[PDB]
């Protein structure tokens, strides 16, 4: 999903993929992988997005985490895990 928000921000600016990659100082293919979600949004990328597009690094990272946590939540055996008690 983070890639969707990035592309939506770019559409509003009328900025193309190549112009985005150029400003981000990344290769075109890396930019595409980021926008399509084929490449996770790392801390360095979060920092770059904050400067180049806007908002804070955490905002971008949280979009990533929200998507990752949403996916992993149903794959974890939370049903059998228990809260630790004071020993
Ligand atoms: Mg690159």
UniProtKB/Swiss-Prot annotation:
Keywords: DNA-binding, Transcription, Transcription regulation. The keyword Protein biosynthesis does not apply. Residues 17-36 bind DNA. Residues 6-60 form the HTH cro/C1-type domain. It comes from Escherichia coli (strain K12). GO terms for biological process: regulation of DNA-templated transcription. GO terms for molecular function: DNA binding. The lineage of its organism: Bacteria, Pseudomonadati, Pseudomonadota, Gammaproteobacteria, Enterobacterales. Pfam families: HTH_3 (PF01381). InterPro entries: Cro/C1-type_HTH (IPR001387), Lambda_DNA-bd_dom_sf (IPR010982), Toxin_antidote_HigA (IPR013430). Belongs to the VapA/VapI family. This is Uncharacterized HTH-type transcriptional regulator YddM. The keyword Ubl conjugation does not apply.
